[PDB]
Amino acid sequence: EKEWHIVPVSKDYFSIPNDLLWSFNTTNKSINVYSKCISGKAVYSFNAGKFMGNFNVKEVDGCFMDAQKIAIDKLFSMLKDGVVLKGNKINDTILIEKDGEVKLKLIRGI
Ligand SMILES: CCCCCC(=O)OC[C@H](O)COP(=O)(O)O
């Protein structure tokens, strides 16, 4: 099992909250997200660098600023529509790419 947090690259994501943690279990192929005010378990596909997933999200009312909510909504919508994941052979950082730009990066660890 590996975990990552997001560092936003695109401005649509500058208000994303910092405590979202993304987990991937290699044994059982499970992908979850966890945080104080959000959780989700992914139904997903990942083929040829293309990731698409539905996280079945739960969100705590009133916990987020309007700006955070919009960023969070956009994030899950984008992950549903599909993104390209770019890993590397140096470390476990992964770029999330869509529509010609890097949208965010996944950095290993809490
Ligand atoms: C916020 C980004 C969506 C979460 C998707 C995710 O963390 O995927 C992990 C991926 O399956 C690991 O495979 P890789 O190490 O071969 O790239």
Swiss-Prot record:
Phenotype seen when the gene is deleted: Inactivation of the gene blocks the Ipa invasin secretory pathway and severely attenuates virulence.
The keyword Signal is annotated on this UniProt entry: yes
Keyword Signal assigned: yes
Cell compartment(s), UniProt: Cell outer membrane
Protein topology in the membrane: Lipid-anchor
Keywords tagged on the record: Cell outer membrane, Lipoprotein, Membrane, Palmitate, Plasmid, Signal, Virulence
Coiled coil: none
GO cellular-component term (any): cell outer membrane
Family indicated by similarity: Belongs to the MxiM family.
Self-association state and partner proteins as the record states: Monomer. Interacts with the secretin MxiD/SctC.
Described purpose of this protein according to its UniProt entry: Involved in the synthesis of the type III secretion system (T3SS), also called injectisome, which is used to inject bacterial effector proteins into eukaryotic host cells. Pilot protein that is required for the proper localization of the secretin MxiD/SctC in the outer membrane. Also influences both MxiD/SctC multimerization and stability. Required for both Ipa translocation and tissue culture cell invasion. Binds lipids.
Protein name, entry field: Type 3 secretion system pilotin
Organism: Shigella flexneri
Residues shown, of full length: 33 to 142 of 142
